[PDB]
Amino acid sequence: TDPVRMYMREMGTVELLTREGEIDIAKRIEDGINQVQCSVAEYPEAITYLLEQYDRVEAEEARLSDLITGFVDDPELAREKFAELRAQYVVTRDTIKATAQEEILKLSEVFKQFRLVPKQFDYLVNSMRVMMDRVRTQERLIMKLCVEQCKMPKKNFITLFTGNETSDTWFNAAIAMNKPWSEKLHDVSEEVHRALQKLQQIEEETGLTIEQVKDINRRMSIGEAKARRAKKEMVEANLRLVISIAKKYTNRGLQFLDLIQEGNIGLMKAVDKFEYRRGYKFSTYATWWIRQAITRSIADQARTIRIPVHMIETINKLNRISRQMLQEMGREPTPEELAERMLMPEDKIRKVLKIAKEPISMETPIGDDEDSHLGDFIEDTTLELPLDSATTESLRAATHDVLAGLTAREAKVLRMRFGIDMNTDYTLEEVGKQFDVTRERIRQIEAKALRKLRHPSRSEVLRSFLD
Amino acid sequence: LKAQTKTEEFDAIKIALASPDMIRSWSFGEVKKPETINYRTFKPERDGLFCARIFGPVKDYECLCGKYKRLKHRGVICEKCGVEVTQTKVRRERMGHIELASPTAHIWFLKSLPSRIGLLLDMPLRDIERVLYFESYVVIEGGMTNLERQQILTEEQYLDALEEFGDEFDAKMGAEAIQALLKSMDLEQECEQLREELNETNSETKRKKLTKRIKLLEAFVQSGNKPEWMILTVLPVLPPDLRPLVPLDGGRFATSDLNDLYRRVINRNNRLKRLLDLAAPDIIVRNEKRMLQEAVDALLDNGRRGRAITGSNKRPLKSLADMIKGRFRQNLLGKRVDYSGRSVITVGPYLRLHQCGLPKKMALELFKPFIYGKLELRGLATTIKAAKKMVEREEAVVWDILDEVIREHPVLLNRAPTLHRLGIQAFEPVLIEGKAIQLHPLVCAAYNADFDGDQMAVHVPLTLEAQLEARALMMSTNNILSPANGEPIIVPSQDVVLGLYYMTRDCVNAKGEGMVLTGPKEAERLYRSGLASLHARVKVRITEYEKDANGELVAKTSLKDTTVGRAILWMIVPKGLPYSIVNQALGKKAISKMLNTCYRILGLKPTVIFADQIMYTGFAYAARSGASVGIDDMVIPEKKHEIISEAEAEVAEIQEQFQSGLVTAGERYNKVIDIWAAANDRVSKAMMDNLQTETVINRDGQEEKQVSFNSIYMMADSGARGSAAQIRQLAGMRGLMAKPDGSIIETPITANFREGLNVLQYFISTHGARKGLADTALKTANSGYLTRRLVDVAQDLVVTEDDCGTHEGIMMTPVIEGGDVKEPLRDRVLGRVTAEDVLKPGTADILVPRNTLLHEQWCDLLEENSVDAVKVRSVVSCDTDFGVCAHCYGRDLARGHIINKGEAIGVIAAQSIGEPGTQLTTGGLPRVADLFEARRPKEPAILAEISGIVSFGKETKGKRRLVITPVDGSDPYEEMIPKWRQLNVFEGERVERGDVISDGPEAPHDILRLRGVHAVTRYIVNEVQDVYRLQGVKINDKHIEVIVRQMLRKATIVNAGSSDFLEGEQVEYSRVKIANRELEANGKVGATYSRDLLGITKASLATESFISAASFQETTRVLTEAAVAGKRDELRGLKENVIVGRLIPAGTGYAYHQDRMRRRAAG
């Protein structure tokens, strides 16, 4: 068993790539992403929304960083380059008068130059497939209302449906066929004709008949899967590379397979950002992406008390220095000796050195004959001792007796100035609004009540709470 | 009546599986980050393992951000951080949860020895695991194709089997598969399969496993649990303060190991959640899923895989399962207690029996809250704050107040190995100066307390009940008899019995010889004036009393022929005792039976005040005696060297015979040991002849000799200290020693302690000493493990019913071991209640009628007549279901009357057996365990199975068959007997079932089966008692009989008509249900059974309350096996009611549970 073996054994079946096979995959990766880019460029909502979002960039409702990251070959170039996309869209929109297919070729051209933010790319991709959920939503209602409910075979229902999927040529014209499956479609006539509104509406928002709505995002599906299928294919060939690299950062405070998994995520990023046209060996390019993810992970989740990376490199400075200072002196550095050899505020070393120690296993055996564990000895300091809580229940009855020895409105003015038997304490002005005559009048009621209680007759009980 | 919603007094406890929906009810947020505290500010990062939004505020009534710090704001959630402002205590109550990316198998149900997920599916573990780590697919509801449901496929096979049947056939791998398997599994449908299969095929290999599985399965349907739930979708997290991150001094931190375990699960779960949005290759996510499975397993129960190690430290991490154990019997190791203390203990002979010396200082700190109150209750302190400053100042008046709180307020005293209930006794406190605890010398015997550095602990009964419990139950003077044998545990020990033996002694010619004194008073006047000697034959007029009237003291006055000392002692003896009780020589032997009779005749109080006066006078006259011990007191016989040379001569002849080949080396060593063994016996009873009587004295005439008055003789003859075996090592030679391997050395230690031993002798004396210290050290351990196994089989046993109402009882006789009576009848039968009327040597005449408690009068009325056997009701026969009737048990207690309802005889039986366990030596203490554990001996005898004429069948085939043939019934019984073990059955004789077919030891399991319940219970008690009675240990058969009742607690059904056919179950449950069947229900469809003898540890294993079982049994298996059954613990019992902190269902709490069990199942 043990997962190290069955992972080692599982990926050992995967065969190393030839130095030529690296290019075969990076080419298939090229095709799939380019295939979806040609499909993204064919979507009118993807053009209008990219124009929707740039009319948001020129009205100071965002920044140029929030939409694009550059084109093929900054505020100057973006305004005129976006007019090129706007120019190429508005000429295509009006020539649908069929023969537009010659000019819709150019709309994809200027749109394939834009490198959007990966945030926006996924949204438009989400906008397309969610728009296909809207298409299929009305598709499956018409299917359940005709086949399952009205008993109509699926051979004759899709006949005039292809090439249409919007009008009533398949519904109200196929009820007049007098077929055994025809006269039964009247029962649901009232239910289908009203839900057809959301279907033929997608031909308006997206500006494409339901026929074209699938054609595009189907090639986008084919292209999208084609990339990952090749991308996955690339990752596996280098699972050995991650292993060998991760074999270096072993005991740094993170489990073995935890490293070769975080490195495996670095190898995953390397395949995405790889460009085979630059001729650098994919192995050596991934070495930095894999060794990044390992060490960038040890910084985060190898500590119980998570610390920033600038602390970890601050720390190593002391350990590397205290390897020198230790032997270089013969004794070892005082907290104020490496204070000098460190640029740091040099008092911070103490504060730094405090938190650098990982917390201690509370289940450490302390070494007694009862096998007492450390945690068995840490006392509760948050607790109020009963010999105290007893007096708290007594200081209560003490002040209550002493407050019934005042004039009645001295209690309501004292219990208001302190928190006694009421929610919160009250600013002496707030108490004044409660008592008509306000302000300085209350200050004397406050002073005189403490004065009647301070003479050794009412104080004799209260004074013994001070020690 | 309204139902309820909130919180009243809970009864019972149910355990079950937790649905993921159930798990989210407990959670007050999902932990999403592996963060703990911040690192500069030590505040808890939100959505971390420590969190204020999820769990609770760090300090009381203070929001985490700080906008709402006032105690006014309470049920308010701060608008910034999702924190309500309550106590920091809720960080100890509130749990969290984690949403798992991939399903995860619960290690406990996958891996606890019988795999629940395994046999619930009827799927093997090496297969489930192969599916769980994604090594091979498993089919799920494979349908009408080519593959079964539980069939298991490989990668290539699934592919080949997919191309043929695309849909209509489903196979998965990983935890999602096993989850689907349990989900799609139908329990009732599989039940109907197992029921038709049971009836169709008749085969013992078929329907032996068939019945074993189905009882869990339909227990699972009835359980309410769902099989999908053993696959975890949500993992709940433990509240943080239960795995805290507290700081230490120097700014260093410490934390429970769970945080390393919980952190890892979160990290790998979060990483997996990422690897899905990165749409990683399956090769990676499979490895990640495997790690998440591993991470959860190391959190719940680390040790059942490869055992993850903790951070930077080699030690492994303590998992949740180990939070519960921490190996066996880990929840009941003990708990430290407030209002307590300890110190060294010392004597204090001035004490009355019911009191003990408590230091001025200990009593001050112990009763502190009483003093504080009693101080301002009288007004010596204005308020408590000053009251503290008073008793801190130790003002003179707080001392006088401390006496007020101390008076009628008993305290508890406890000495180290608490063996029987007498190890904790309640005394009335006496304020004493110094730091030592003063202990009454008579209660020393109970505690096993010397004063060689031993310490005792003290406890304050706080509540009013505990003070009355301590006063009426645990008081020194309420427990003067041992509960192991109705004899007094408050015997005079040593110092005192020397005193009385010195008093009640007489010498031939002493000052006062022959005068006549009006009464005992003038006899003390004669001694304290130096006129009469303490031991001089002297007639004195004494009056004695006897209550021979109907409860009235008849007086009689005479001139009894006694001594001066025994006259003065009579001034102590109370009322209705005969002067004959002191007229003798009064050793520790006779001095305890004196005390016993006072209790059985005059009652408790006059016995308590008696024992005090026996100690006071004993100490005083022992101190007056001037008894010492000098070097010349150990008198070596003048004939010692003679005896040695004589046996030294015999051995030189046995050697002479060996040289000439007349005798063998094995005979020589054996024959030489015998003449040395004899010589030691000769020197022994040579020194004892001289030592005992050689005091030759003279009265008016020539000579006359009597028992010696030498110091060291009186010490032994009285019984105070010293034993003839030990004395023999001082004057006479000290024994033959044993060399290490077990041989006894053929030249014994000729020298003794009054002389010197030399290098060689002492060096050989060493091994005996060291193996002595080791044997006595180990047999102190074995005993303690026995009393554990014994209370674990008993504990819950309580005198519940008044009189079960039976005539069933065991026939009681004197043991009469070969020679003569190794135990009288009067001892075995006293205190028990008769089963039926006993008759004189002639009949028509009842002497004691039916169930009367045979006490001392009845036992004599028995011993007057020639009654040689009495049928007696015994615990093993008490027909009470769930407990023991008070009648059938008997009378014994530290008090003399029949057992009271509710006493927990189960414990006090087990205690009484294992308390003397230290003092035993096949034979010895393991021979006791062998019996109580029901352990079959190695080479047993076989018993006659069925009555009839026996004969031999077939020939030698490794086994030689025996065919018995009853006269009337069927004869098909044939037993395979290995004929290389010499037989004893007569080959043409009619054999009665249960007779000796071969000889040698016998298994109890047979005895119960063949000869019956009454024979096996007799076999145990007489066989364990032989171990104790050999070592001089008095244990009433009662206690062994309650243990035996637990051994045969279970039975196996033979016939049916109601429940199963072969199951083992309690006669309590069975008998309660076939009694329910003789009427009602069916006319009588009732089942027959057969009593089953279990060893104590096997019998203890069967407990209804799983909380009790999770104490001493393996806690994982009990918890798992009970959680799958959805088992309800009703409490009811002892062990669990302690674990949960409420009144014991016995003693004072017995009245509480009886009032509770009746409101339950009623309206």
Ligand SMILES: Nc1ncnc2c1ncn2[C@@H]1OC(COP(=O)(O)OP(=O)(O)O)=C(OP(=O)(O)OP(=O)(O)O)C1=O
């Ligand atoms: N119930 C008790 N009855 C009599 N004696 C007791 C009792 N408990 C503790 N001692 C003595 O107190 C220490 C050990 O105490 P603890 O086991 O470490 O536990 P805790 O630290 O919590 O006190 C030993 O005495 P000593 O150290 O003098 O050496 P000793 O065992 O040979 O007598 C014990 O006899």
Ligand SMILES: [Mg+2]
């Ligand atoms: Mg001692």
Ligand SMILES: [Zn+2]
């Ligand atoms: Zn807040």
Ligand SMILES: [Zn+2]
């Ligand atoms: Zn009974």
